[PDB]
Design a protein around this ligand. Sequence first.
Ligand SMILES: Nc1nc2c(ncn2[C@@H]2O[C@H](CO)[C@@H](OP(=O)(O)O)[C@H]2O)c(=O)[nH]1
Ligand SMILES: [Ca+2]
Length: 104
Amino acid sequence: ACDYTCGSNCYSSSDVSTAQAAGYKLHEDGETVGSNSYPHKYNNYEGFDFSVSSPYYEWPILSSGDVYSGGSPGADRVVFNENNQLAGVITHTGASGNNFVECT
Ligand SMILES: Nc1nc2c(ncn2[C@@H]2O[C@H](CO)[C@@H](OP(=O)(O)O)[C@H]2O)c(=O)[nH]1
Ligand SMILES: [Ca+2]
């Protein structure tokens, strides 16, 4: 069973922890990767009711299982905060335009 399901993409808790660790490391070092500069601030315009405090940062999680290093980030993202706490897993899949919906 999937711990998080983003459209057709299936992720386990370890998939998320691994992606999150990479994104947080970059955040701590003040570095970014890719043309859209990840990780970067996630404003939560969608208004998700996250259990942890802001600020939030978004970082791509790939269905291939690899850690994001550049190029297309796909539709999925892990959202973490300043204390490296997982806020949630979100996706562009099933959402209009560049909006997000939560992975179930
Ligand atoms: N939909 C949405 N986009 C956000 C939010 N906060 C920041 N963004 C940025 O606006 C764009 C929406 O897809 C993305 O930038 P990026 O394309 O540079 O990665 C995304 O990172 C938010 O809360 N909602
Ligand atoms: Ca996996």
